[PDB]
Structures are given as C-alpha cells and as structure tokens.
Structure 1
Amino acid sequence: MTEIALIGNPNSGKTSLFNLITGHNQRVGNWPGVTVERKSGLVKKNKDLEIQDLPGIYSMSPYSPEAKVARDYLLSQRADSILNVVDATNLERNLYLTTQLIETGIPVTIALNMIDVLDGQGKKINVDKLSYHLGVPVVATSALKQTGVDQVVKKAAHTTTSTVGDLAFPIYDDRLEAAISQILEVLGNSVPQRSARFYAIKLFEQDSLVEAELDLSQFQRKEIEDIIRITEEIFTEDAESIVINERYAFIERVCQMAESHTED
C-alpha cells in the first residue's frame, strides 16, 4: 500500500499527529527524543494508507542513533511520501531539514504544526507564499486543537512519487549548482536516480556517512575531489560552509516571504 513517513525535528508533534491519524496512543512527551523506533499504523479515514512514526531528526547527517533510524528509513526507498512535520514557532531552524528532505526526491508535504502556539504568540505565516517558495504543499495543523490533520494526510496521499511529475528542488547559488551538476555526471547510476541530488550535495560537503555508504570507484572519487577543489577556489570558501550558507540563505529568503503580509 501507500507508505507515508512522518519526518521532522524532535518535539514537533509527530507522534501526536500519528495518534490522531491512526487511533493509536503512542508515547507523546514534552521533550525532544521521546520516540526511539519506527511504529506503523493505518490511516483511519483511508485504510489504503500506512503511516510511519519515526524518531525526530535535525539533519540528514544525523546527531544520534535514534535520528539515524529516520534517515535510513527514507534512504531505504520504502516511503512514497514524506509528511514533514514542522514546528511553526521555530520555522527557520526546522526548514534546514526540509531542504534536505526535498532533495531525496520523495515528495514532501508540510504539516505546519503547533499553529495554535503561533496564533497565541500574535503571529502569522502566509501558507500560500511559504508553499510557493518552498515548492511543496503546506497545511497548517494543530494536534492540540485537532485542526488540519485530515487535510494534510489527504494532500500527502495525493503528493506521491507516482503522481508528482518533475520535482522542484531548492535552487542555490549557480556556482554551486554547476558543481552539483558535475558531481551528478560523475555518479551516473552509482546512486538511485530519485535521490541523486541529495547524494551529490552530501558528497560536495564530504559527508562521512554518505562517503562510507556509496561504493564509489577511485576514478569517481578523484573527479569529485577535483570538482570540490575548483569550486572552493571559485567561492573563496570551504565546501562544508558553502552548502550550510546556501541552505541558510535559501531559508532566509523563504521565511521573509512567509512573514510578508503584503499582496503580490
């Protein structure tokens, strides 16, 4: 059946949503790191959908074994849809992960959760603008007030690897895009086609996990090493910082659009 993965920072309301969606009473708690293993369940309002609760994760270069369970689930290619649960009150921080999720090529739908806390803070987010600039569907949800939950599941079900055509990725500085294209050429079929961009950017960043997982030839490694060196000279910066700063810069732009109330 259709597999929907709940992915997002710890303490963002993933399990709270899962409980509402499935009828389960899985562990929910007011600190990061409550869920520690995968839990499956059927969506109650549509039994053709299976949803997976997973440990929280801050980055796809993860900081804990628990987060690595979420990462490895996604890179195993089992999910048809990512339901990215985003804490609306800490948007910028949460979108760091989001950018990497979009790059996997598994279609992303955002549950913009804890919208009730944002409402209580006297703040708002332009959901249509956020969606437009991020290139993914966005539904405002509250697991507390039980709003938007059935809507975001329906959207996630409709936003699948089988229904979505050409996927729209976050576009960075064209000097980085050039290096990404070069790395993709070198990789060829050495990575799954759907997630190739994710892996190419991780190779540029010289991510240890990804370098260990991919069985790249000496030839490929030498050409990638050369592409990174050339690009660092162009940027006048190290590779790791180039990518971090480009993600940050992208998120900054999108968030100033999400804060924008003025009609356009």
Structure 2
Amino acid sequence: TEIALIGNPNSGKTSLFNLITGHNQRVGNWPGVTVERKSGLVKKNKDLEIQDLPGIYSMSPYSPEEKVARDYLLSQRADSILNVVDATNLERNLYLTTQLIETGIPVTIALNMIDVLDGQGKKINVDKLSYHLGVPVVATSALKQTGVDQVVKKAAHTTTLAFPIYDDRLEAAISQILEVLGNSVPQRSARFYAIKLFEQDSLVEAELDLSQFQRKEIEDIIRITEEIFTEDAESIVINERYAFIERVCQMAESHTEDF
C-alpha cells in the first residue's frame, strides 16, 4: 500500500515521515526543505510504503519542487493521500485539501501542529471538521509525538467517494464537462480534471490531449455557465472553494453539541 504525504510546505511532512519510518530526512523551519520524493517503509506495518514529497500550496503550483508533488499525485501511483494540514493555518491549508479530494485518491488528514494550536489556547472540533470535509481527520503532533501511529493506521484503512459539493449551477457544468471527457482522463481523477478545465488551467489544458470537438464543447459549457453565474470561470471556482472552506472552518471552530 502506497501512502503519500501531501500538504503545504513547512507543515511537518518530513517530521512525520521520520517518526513513521525511523529515517532522519531533512527537517527545517522554513518552506521548501524537501525537494524530491523519499520512500520508506512504515515501521509498525511493513506492508505500507510511505512517500515524503516536497510541499505544495495548490494543484496549480509555482515552483519545480511543487511540480514534483503534483506530477507524483497525477501519476496515479498513490493508494492513499495522507494530507498533512497545519492546524494553526487551517483555512489556507484546506485550499489544497479540497483539490486533493477531487483526485479521487482517498484522503486522510493529519491535523498537525496541534500542540501549537493548544498553546495558542485554541481548539478545532475534529469530528465536525471530518464530517463536513467528508474525510477522516486525526490530530497529530510530530513534536509531542501524538496521533502519529493512529493517522497512519487510518490512512492505510482508506485504501481497502464524497467530494466537496459546490453551487448547483457549477455542479451542472462539472457534470457536463465529465460527459464530454469520457475516458480521456483517468476515471478516479475525472472531477479534478473537469474542474481544472472549467477554470481553463494552462497546465491541464496542455497535459490532456483533447480533440477539437471536446475542446469546443467545453468552451461552450464554460461560456453558458459564466452567463448563468454572471462571473468569469476562474472566479467561480476559486469563490466556490473559498465559500466551502469558510463553512467548514466555521464548523471546525464550533464546539456546540449537535442534537
């Protein structure tokens, strides 16, 4: 079982990797430490091979190091994404998370640096956060060495799909683009690609070898949807992503009992 450590730079990926595998890979207090993939067997379960990757802020990234993690993800090798999330910068970290879920590779969140959040006198409702994100979440600290074995066990158990649901009208366009795509994208990641094409992402547009006919249909779908939303395609998706994350964070900061 192949488990990939994916998350923003400086979120504690390698720190967790080292704890999990017994390795002593490079860890530092600045973003951009890890620059290539490192594999290692999980000590407590030798059937699992975990992968340390350079940090990434989104799936439309701006450095060669970020490209290593993106290419790795879209190569379809991973069985599990162990998404390492900085608990003290939750909203910013969840941007990538929502794109990761869209790849259809099951996501498990290591809600890391929980000890820092503790010292800030702050709290995250782990169960609400997991419920609204539709993924398992385990609070971890690579510093205090807590939750680490638990989150790996959980990630492993996901390899044996709910996505963030946006505005109906955007969902209608994503479904239309999915139809146009057919088998021209890997089935598991289809939604990730459909959304990126809606956004007119340069990388995805160059990567996929779509026919003129597919491209014209997608163009027409985008134009129709922009007129429906009275907003440009790029903004539609970014805003939907932001609104989803905002709702999620408000749930995550809510410690009231649900009756």
Question: How far does residue 160 in structure 1 lie from its aligned partner after superposition?
Answer: 1.3
Query: What per-residue deviation string (whole Å, max 9, x for no partner) do you get for residues 211-237 of structure 1?
Result: 000000000000000000000000001
2:46 is paired with a residue of what secondary structure? coil
Q: Which residue is 1:164 aligned to? A: none
Q: Which residue of 1 aligns with 2:201?
A: 207
> 2:40 is paired with a residue of what secondary structure?
strand
Corresponding residue of 2:165: 171
1:63 Cα deviation (Å)?
Answer: 1.1
- Cα shift at 1:121: 0.2
Which ranges of 4 or more aligned residues in structure 1 deviate by more than 6 Å? Answer: none
Q: Distance in 1 between matches of 2:31 and 2:72?
A: 20
Superposition deviation, residue 60 in structure 1? 0.3
Match of 2:252 in 1: 258
Query: 1:185 offset after TM fit, Å?
Result: 0.3
**TM-score between both structures, scaled by the size of structure 2:** 0.99
1:135-168 CA distance string (max 9 Å, x none)? 000000000000000000000000116xxxxx00
RMSD: 0.5
Mapped partners of 2:183, 2:71: distance in 1: 20
Segments of structure 1 that go 5 or more residues without pairing to the other structure are: 162-166
TM-score (norm 1): 0.97
Distance, in Å, in 1 between the alignment partners of 2:67 and 2:196 is 15
The aligned counterpart of 1:223 is 217
Q: Look up the match of 1:55.
A: 54
Runs of at least 5 residues in structure 2 that lack an aligned partner in the other structure:
none
Equivalent residue of 1:42, what SS?
Answer: strand
Aligned residues: 258
Aligned match of 1:239: 233
Q: Cα deviation per residue 1:56-75 (whole Å; 9 max; x = unaligned)?
A: 00000111110110011010
Deviation at 1:9, TM superposition (A): 0.1
State the shift of 1:82 in Å: 0.1
Equivalent position of 1:20 in the other structure: 19
Aligned to 2:109, what secondary structure does the other structure show? strand
Percent identical residues: 100
| Distance in 2 between residues matched to 1:262 and 1:148, nearest whole Å | 24
